[PDB]
Amino acid sequence: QVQLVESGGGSVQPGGSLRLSCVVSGYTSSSRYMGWFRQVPGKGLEWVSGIKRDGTNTYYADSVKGRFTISQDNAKNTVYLQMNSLKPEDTAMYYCAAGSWYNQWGYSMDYWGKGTQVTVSSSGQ
Amino acid sequence: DYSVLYNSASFSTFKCYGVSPTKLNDLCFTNVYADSFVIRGDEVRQIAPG
Amino acid sequence: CVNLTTRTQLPPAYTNSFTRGVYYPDKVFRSSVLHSTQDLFLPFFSNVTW
Amino acid sequence: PSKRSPIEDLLFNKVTLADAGFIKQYGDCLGDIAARDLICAQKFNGLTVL
Amino acid sequence: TLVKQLSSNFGAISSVLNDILSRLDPPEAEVQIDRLITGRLQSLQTYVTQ
Amino acid sequence: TLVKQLSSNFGAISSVLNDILSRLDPPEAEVQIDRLITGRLQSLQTYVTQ
Amino acid sequence: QQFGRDIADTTDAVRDPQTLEILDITPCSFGGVSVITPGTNTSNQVAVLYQDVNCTEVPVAIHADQLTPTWRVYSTGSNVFQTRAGCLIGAEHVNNSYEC
C-alpha cells in the first residue's frame, strides 16, 4: 500500500558533500514522521535525523550535530538529507523510515525503504 | 525510571497507548508486565491495538 | 566611558497610585459603552516606588 | 398626532426602548423623521425582528 | 441525578479530572477534558431547563 | 448573549471561520468548523428554549 | 484607532488605511421569504413577501441563485408594494378595508 524510494548516495572524499533524497507514497499523513537511520556494518541501526509534516522539533544525534541538515517538501512528498563534512565513520548504509511522532503518545517507525550506501573514502567506492 | 529509556534514542518505536511517556515517572502501577519477542520491521506495525 | 562613584544610600519612599496607569488595551473604537478587558494593568491604589 | 390619552402618553414615554440590545436603534429609526430612507432592518447575524 | 452524572466518562478515559491530568500530556489532556466539560454542561443545562 | 456567543472558540483555534479556512488544510479545518458548529448550534438551542 | 466594534462585539466602522476616512459597515440586505397562498384546493396563484427588504433591492437581484426564469416571472410582477413588513410582490393594493 506504501512505498519509500531512496536515492542520491555514493562515495566522496572526506570533507565533501552529498544529498540523499527519500520519496514517500501511500500515507494519509496527518502526523507523518520521516527519519534517516544509519547502519554501520557489524552494528545495529542508529538515529541520524527525523522531521514531521511541518512540526519541526527535529532530531539529530549527539555526534552528528552541524554536519547534517534535514529538509522536506510536502508538495512532492519528499524529504532530503544534506550531507556536509563527511568524516570517515559516516561510511555506512542510510535508510529512510516513515511513521508517526505524536506529542502525547510517542513514535512508531511503521515502514522502511530500500536504502542507499555512502562511502567516505580517499579512493571512492 | 522510565524516563531514562524514553530519552535514549536507542529505540525505533516507543509508543504508549493510555498514558503519555513523559508522565510515567509520576505514576504508581499495580501490576506491570514485560512481554518480549522478535519480529521483523515490516511487522512492528502490527503490535498495536486494532 | 566613566563610572563616577559618587554613591550614597537612602531607604526607599512610596506613594499611592490612585486611579492612574490605565491605557487603551487595543486600537478599537467604542462609543458610549462599558467594556470589560483582561490585561496587564497597574492595580488601583497600588504601592508605586518613588 | 397619536390619538392617545395623556396617561397613555406617559406610558409610551416611560418604557423607553433605549439601552436594550440593538432594538434601541431600531426604535429610534422608527421615530426618525428628518433622516428619511433609513433601512434599519438587517441588523445582525441572521437575527430579525418582525 | 445531577450529582451522580459526575461519575460518567462521556467518552474520556476517566471521569476524574485529576487522574486524567496525571496520565496524559497537554495536547490530549485538553481533548479529554473537553469531553468531560461538554457532558457536564449538557447535564447542567438539562437540570436548569426542567 | 446570543450574539456574543459568536465570539467564542469552543476549543477551536479561532472563532472566525475565515481564519480557520485560510490557515489550515481542508481535513483539519473540517474538525475545527465542526467544533464551532456544535457550539453555535447549542447556543441557538439554548436561546430558543429560554 | 483603526476600526470600531459596537456592543455585542461586531465591527461597525473602519478607517481607510490610505486616506484616514471613516466608513460605516452595514450588512447588505438579507431577509426571509414568505409565500402567501390561498390554498392548493382553491388556486395555484401565490404572492411573495421579502420580509425586511426594500423594494429597490429585489429587482436589482433578479439574477439571484434561487431566482430561475420561472421564479423571475413572479419576481418581475408589476405589482410591487412596499409595506412596513417588507416588499410584497404579486398582491394588488386596495384602498378598502376588510377583516384580516
Swiss-Prot record, chain B:
The chain holds residues 364 to 413 of 1273 of the full protein. Attaches the virion to the cell membrane by interacting with host receptor, initiating the infection. The major receptor is host ACE2. When S2/S2' has been cleaved, binding to the receptor triggers direct fusion at the cell membrane. When S2/S2' has not been cleaved, binding to the receptor results in internalization of the virus by endocytosis using host TFRC and GRM2 and leading to fusion of the virion membrane with the host endosomal membrane. Alternatively, may use NRP1/NRP2 and integrin as entry receptors. It comes from the Viruses. Changing S8F: In strain: Omicron/BA.2, Omicron/BA.2.12.1, Omicron/BA.2.75, Omicron/BA.4, Omicron/BA.5, Omicron/BQ.1.1, Omicron/XBB.1.5, Omicron/EG.5.1. Changing D42N: In strain: Omicron/BA.2, Omicron/BA.2.12.1, Omicron/BA.2.75, Omicron/BA.4, Omicron/BA.5, Omicron/BQ.1.1, Omicron/XBB.1.5, Omicron/EG.5.1; complete loss of interaction with host integrins. Changing S8L: In strain: Omicron/BA.1. Changing R45S: In strain: Omicron/BA.2, Omicron/BA.2.12.1, Omicron/BA.2.75, Omicron/BA.4, Omicron/BA.5, Omicron/BQ.1.1, Omicron/XBB.1.5, Omicron/EG.5.1. This is Spike protein S1. Residues 40-42 are annotated as: Integrin-binding motif. Binds to host ACE2. RBD also interacts with the N-linked glycan on 'Asn-90' of ACE2. Cleavage of S generates a polybasic C-terminal sequence on S1 that binds to host Neuropilin-1 (NRP1) and Neuropilin-2 (NRP2) receptors. Interacts with host integrin alpha-5/beta-1 (ITGA5:ITGB1) and with ACE2 in complex with integrin alpha-5/beta-1 (ITGA5:ITGB1). May interact via cytoplasmic c-terminus with M protein. May interact (via N-terminus) with host bilirubin and biliverdin, thereby preventing antibody binding to the SARS-CoV-2 spike NTD via an allosteric mechanism. It comes from Severe acute respiratory syndrome coronavirus 2.
